[PDB]
Every structure is written in C-alpha cells, then in structure tokens.
Design a protein around this ligand. Structure first.
Ligand SMILES: Nc1ncnc2c1ncn2[C@@H]1O[C@H](COP(=O)(O)OP(=O)(O)O)[C@@H](O)[C@H]1O
Ligand code: BEF
Ligand SMILES: [Cl-]
Ligand SMILES: [Mg+2]
Length: 703
C-alpha cells in the first residue's frame, strides 16, 4: 500500500531511484510543473482505483497528464512487486509513441532506451534496463502473436482508444479475454473524447475516473459562412494569423501528402510576398505525413525563427500535417490550430475488395482532439473552418471503427494467428454482422486458407503475409504453377487498387481511343496488364508520367500505387522461397496461362451464359442473373467467364470480365466444383456435360 505522498517523496529525492545517479536540475524544473497538472490532484484516487480493480477507465481533458503521468504513477507502484515485467502504453501513431517516450524519459531523468523506451514496427529502442515502454497498438499486437498471454507486461495501458483502430479494437477484445485468464495483469483504457459508459460496460462494468479541468484554455472560433475550397480557406487563415496575431506557431491539418506539399509551397510563396510588402515576420513551413522520412519528421520540433528586427512582428512556424498529429503529440510553441475538418479515412469496397483512402468529414471527437493540440503549454485558440451549426448537427460524434471499414477476411486470418478459435462469438466492442463474419469464413474456407475444422492452413498463413485481399494472395501464390507469376504479380497489384480508367464526361471519345490501345479481346485483366506495361514502358524512356497518364486517360495515383504494391509483393515471395517465372510472349499458351491463373483466386466469381439467344449470364455464387458490363474489351464473350466485380445499378452487371474454359474450373478448384455434392441446377448440368465430354474425348484417343 504505497501512497502518492510516499512516491512524491521519492520523486523529490536527490538520487534517482532507478539509476542511482543524482537528479538533474532539469528534472526538478519539470517535476514542479508536472504537479500542477489536473491528474496530480487525483493521484491517490487513481491508486485507490488501481489497487482494487483489474480494469480501469480514465478520462480527462486534452493535456491533463494522462499519457505522461499515469504510467509513471503505475511505475512507482509496480516495481516493489519484483515481477520483472514491464508497463506498456500504446499510441496509435509512430511519431506519438517516439515523442512521448523521449518526454517521459526526460520526466524520469533517464536516457531514452534505458528505463523508458519505445517499440515500433522497425525499431525497438529498448534494452534490458527498460521498465516503461511506449509502443504502438500494432507493435503490441505483433508481440501478442508470439506471446498470447503477454507474459512480459504487468500493466497494459491502451492510450487513445477513441480512434478505434484495427489494432486497438482487437487488443481490447484480446485483453478482455486475458483478464479472466490472467489476474496479475492490470488494464487501463484512457482517452479524452471517449464513450466512457460504453467502455465501462464492455470491460465487465469497469470503474470510471473522471478528471476535470484544463491546464490552459482553448478558444474555439467558427466561420460564419461555408467555404468549399478548404485548402484556400486554410491558406487564407494561416496568412491572417501571421499578419494580425501575436507570437505563436500554427498547426494546420490537411488530408494527404500531395495536398500539403502544394499547400506548403503556396504558403511560403505568399508569405514571401507578405514580407516584402506588409513588413511581417518570417514563417517557417514544415510538412508532416506518414510517408515522410523520420529525420525530416523530427524537424517539426525545430525552433521558430526570430524576427527580422528587434521589436518587429514575431517569427512563426507553420506545421501543415495530416491526422498523424491529431492525437498524442504535444508540440511546444503551438498556439493556433486551423481545422478544415477533413481527413483521409479508410473505406472498403465490398464488390472489388479494395481498401482505399477517401477524404471525408472528421468527427466531433477528432475536432476536439485537433483543438487539444493547443492549450497544453500555454493558452491557445483553434480556428475551425466550418459552421458551429455544422459542428453540432452535421458532424458525427465518434469516428467509425476501422474494423467495420476494413477487409474482414484479412482480419480473420490475423485473428487466427493471434489464437482466436471462435470468430462469430469474438467479443468485439462493435463487431461486424454475423452474416458478414460467416461470409468471410465461408470464402476463406473455399480458398483453402482455413480448413473444414476452421483452423489456419499454411496457405492461409502465407496469404496473411501479403497486404492483399486473400483471394488475390492465393492467386499470387498459385501463380508459378501456371507459369505466369511475373504477370499475375502485376495483375494482383492493379486489382488491389481502384480502377485506373479515367473517362471524363467532356472527353469520352478521346478516353476510349487511348484505352483501345491497350484493349485485349479475351479479358479485361489483360487490358489492365497491357496498360501497366505501357506505364512502365514510358517510365523507362524518361517521360513525365503525370503528363503521360493524363494524356492516356489513366489514373496516375492508382497506377503508381500498384507499382509500389507490386514491389512489395515481389519481395514477399522472394523471402519465402517462391518461384518467379513467366512464359515467353510468343508461346502458344501465354495468354491462356494468365486466364487460367485468375481462377486460382476467382473461381467463385464465375458466370455462365443461359442461352445462345440471351446475353444474360448466371453467376455461380447465389445464382444471380447478370449482364456483361459495357466497359468490356471482350468483343465476344465465351459461354463461361470469370469476373472481378459485381455491379449493382439499374441493371445487374459483372465488371472486369475474362473469357475462360469451363474445364478449367474442375481442374483448378475441384473442391468447390465437386460435382458429387454440388447444387442441383443448370450450371451443374452444364458442368457435368463438360466433364463427360472430356471423358469421351480422352478415352477414344486412348483407343
Ligand atoms: N514535449 C513536451 N514539452 C513540454 N511540455 C510537455 C511535453 N509533453 C507533455 N507536456 C506537458 O504535459 C502535459 C500532459 O501531456 P499528456 O500527458 O500527453 O496529455 P494528455 O493527458 O492529454 O494525453 C501537456 O499538456 C504539457 O503541459
Ligand atoms: F488527450 Be491528450 F491530448 F492526449
Ligand atoms: Cl482510418
Ligand atoms: Mg495523450
């Protein structure tokens, strides 16, 4: 029963209890400011709730001291038990876990990597001396794959569960099960914008600890009129702050990497025309996105420029960022936050099995977390570029969970690697529908990624290593047996992105003209492969590919993404010892090999023509009646086709269609097309005739 005042006396000591060295003067200056935080008045109320409850819910305002102080409150309590375990705190972003770990190491007067450290995907800045670890939720989930009981941690702190990521929602379900299995494990879930009663009721009616109060206020300013060009409204507001507001840096939130790098250039050019004319101060402009290098990512903590003259307008720092800085980070010197209200949120197309990023409105919880990046070290204000009534009535309260916006079949294979056995009764906080979960289990069993008992096959474990929809990964893994593994490697990448065709309403004719350069009459998949080959062909000549894709009416963003995916997918097969073969182009079976190899992943998406009079096709799965989509490069479709996408519109269509032979269905997928147990119907009768026709064909040639 170690009290808070007992621990404060150790914090006030000259000697570091963790290292045995003398405390620095910087440590005491930080500790004096740490105790003015709103969580410090309730340190004993926290310890009373922590000793008596296994799972704890913590809420407090942005900047209260949740991330920085509570693991140190736990660390002072947990060391006398001599467990040899560690304290784990999860942040959803890599830069947030790195920056906080350097802060808490400074707060504890230790060197980063020793008693306090971080662990991310490709860096583990820990050691034997490490006691507190600030990791990501994905990195803790990767350790849960090899250690399902998490035997290395005595306390798990799930910081910022409000973002509801894929790793966080899974970790909440895993730790809730582990709470019944392990009673020597403590679980803390904390956030500032949280459905606390929902998180309470999920964790076996756990207690709640509410901390009121802010360190510094944040004034919320709204625009009276809606402005559509949010980039123009953002750049206008940043220049207005540098002109007419006192000293203090700006944090700008925009959606994508290309959006801010244009905006970082447009701001710096309009700043330089404010310097020469309006006699304002200098402005440093810094970008921040996820694909940016870390040594340039750490430049956002770089000091504001000084003014040109003593007594002049203040020099300023503008950080234009994505929502990578929405949570967790405390950037010193930020006074102003501009909120356009948009972010790139992951969506899932169920017909094409593609996870893509869409610019969408942020939630109410994201706006408060964005405004909470100020008001931490000094008072601040947030400029929301939207109506107050748009905040109250148009914005949703909580961000939609990532597990409902992701590929469920990819999620299921990761959960089997985590040790989950009952998937339909897995207690997620917001689970998918049981029709949706069983459909993922139905497809993954037919793809041989799961057996009939439901356990993970070695095909499913290997398909989980690829960042693809699992039907595309089975197609890539089976590709060397069809002698077209270099070609399927490109086709899976183009099928993992949205459609590359650009058909504007003002230029339909010129769009179809450039598309017909790549058109293959046997399949749309070969038309995709031809267009990617033309992209990589003009790239080797030295042409401007943005100019090339615009003139050839192709999406540059989707084609360049598939080229980066194909480089990723090519490396995964090389490290796993998979052959990478291709047939020469003038082989008689070059194109038939590629059309055969599509059925290794897409045997379930097959249509059969009903009658010779009709253009209506009937699908194998669920007997749907479809037409061929008019975007097809197939001039005359066969009686049997494979398709990538079911299209529901005023008429039911199938898109990305390739002609196949029905005898390939029995060869490639015999378990699904087992005619012993197949469903009665016209497709079965047509398939048994195909098996009989090749039977009388081969037997008479044996005669
Ligand atoms: N790098 C830093 N530099 C200066 N002050 C910091 C830093 N990190 C945190 N702080 C201070 O500690 C407070 C608590 O931060 P934190 O614990 O992350 O807040 P929250 O509880 O909102 O997650 C901040 O409001 C700020 O006053
Ligand atoms: F809630 Be805090 F801004 F991490
Ligand atoms: Cl997201
Ligand atoms: Mg925090």
């Amino acid at each position: 029963g170690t009290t808070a005042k007992q621990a404060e006396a150790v914090e006030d000591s000259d000697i570091n209890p963790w290292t045995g060295q003398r405390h620095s003067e910087r440590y005491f200056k930080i500790l004096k400011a740490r105790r003015k935080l709103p969580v410090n008045k309730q340190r004993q109320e926290f310890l009373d709730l922590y000793h008596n409850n296994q799972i704890l819910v913590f809420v407090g305002e942005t900047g209260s001291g949740k991330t920085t102080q509570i693991p140190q409150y736990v660390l002072y309590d947990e060391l006398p038990h001599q467990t040899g375990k560690l304290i784990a705190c999860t942040q959803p972003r890599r830069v947030a876990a790195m920056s906080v770990a350097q802060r808490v190491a400074d707060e504890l007067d230790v060197k980063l990597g020793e008693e306090v450290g971080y662990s991310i995907r490709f860096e583990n800045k820990t050691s034997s001396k490490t006691l507190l670890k600030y990791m990501t939720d994905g990195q803790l989930l990767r350790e849960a794959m090899h250690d399902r009981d998490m035997s290395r941690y005595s306390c798990i702190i799930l910081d910022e569960a409000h973002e509801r990521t894929l790793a966080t929602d899974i970790l909440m379900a895993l730790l809730k099960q582990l709470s019944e299995r392990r009673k020597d494990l403590k679980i803390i879930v904390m956030s500032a914008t949280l459905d606390a009663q929902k998180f309470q009721s999920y964790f076996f009616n756990a207690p709640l600890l509410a901390v009121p109060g802010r360190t510094h206020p944040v004034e919320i300013f709204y625009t009276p009129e809606a402005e559509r060009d949010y980039v123009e409204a953002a750049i206008r507001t940043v220049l207005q702050i540098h002109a007419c507001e006192p000293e203090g840096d700006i944090l700008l939130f925009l959606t994508g990497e290309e959006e801010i790098e244009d905006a970082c250039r447009r701001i710096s050019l309009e700043v330089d025309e404010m310097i020469r004319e309006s006699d304002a101060g200098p402005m440093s402009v810094y970008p921040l996105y996820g694909t940016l290098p870390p040594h340039q990512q750490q430049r956002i903590f770089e000091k504001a420029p000084q003014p040109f003259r003593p007594g002049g307008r203040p020099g300023r720092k503008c950080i234009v960022a994505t929502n990578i800085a929405e949570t967790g980070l405390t950037i010193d010197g930020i006074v102003y936050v501009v909120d356009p209200g948009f972010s790139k949120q992951k969506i899932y197309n169920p017909r094409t099995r593609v996870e893509s990023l869409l610019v969408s409105p942020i939630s109410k919880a994201s706006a408060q977390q964005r405004a909470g990046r100020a008001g931490r070290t000094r008072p601040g204000k947030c400029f929301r570029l939207y109506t107050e009534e748009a905040f109250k009535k148009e914005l949703i309260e909580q961000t939609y969970p990532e597990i409902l916006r992701s590929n469920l079949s990819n999620t299921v294979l990761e959960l089997k690697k985590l040790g989950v056995e009952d998937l339909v009764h897995f207690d997620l906080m917001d689970p998918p529908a049981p029709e949706t979960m069983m459909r993922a289990l139905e497809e993954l069993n037919y793809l041989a990624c799961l057996d009939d008992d439901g356990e993970l096959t070695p095909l499913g474990n290997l398909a989980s290593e690829f960042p693809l929809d699992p039907a595309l990964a089975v197609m890539l893994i089976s590709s060397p047996e069809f002698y077209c593994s270099n070609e399927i490697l490109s086709i899976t990448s183009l099928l993992s992105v949205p459609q590359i065709w650009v058909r504007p309403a003002n230029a339909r004719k010129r769009a179809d003209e450039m598309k017909a350069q790549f058109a293959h009459p046997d399949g749309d998949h070969l038309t995709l492969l031809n267009a990617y080959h033309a992209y990589k062909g003009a790239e080797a000549r030295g042409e401007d590919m943005k100019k090339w894709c615009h003139e050839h009416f192709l999406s540059y963003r989707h084609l360049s993404s598939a080229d980066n995916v194909r480089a990723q997918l090519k490396k995964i097969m090389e490290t796993h010892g998979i052959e990478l073969v291709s047939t020469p182009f003038h082989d008689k079976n070059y194109y038939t090999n590629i059309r055969r190899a599509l059925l290794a992943g897409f045997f379930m998406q097959v249509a059969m023509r009903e009658s010779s009079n009709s253009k209506v096709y009937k699908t194998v799965k669920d007997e749907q009646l479809v037409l061929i989509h008019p975007s097809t490069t197939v001039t005359t479709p066969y009686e049997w086709v494979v398709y990538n996408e079911f299209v529901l519109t005023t008429k039911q269509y199938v898109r990305t269609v390739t002609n196949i032979r029905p005898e390939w269905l029995l060869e490639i997928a015999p378990v699904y097309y087992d005619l012993s147990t197949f469903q009665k119907g016209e497709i079965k009768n047509a398939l048994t005739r195909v098996a009989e026709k090749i039977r009388r064909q081969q037997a008479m040639k044996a005669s």
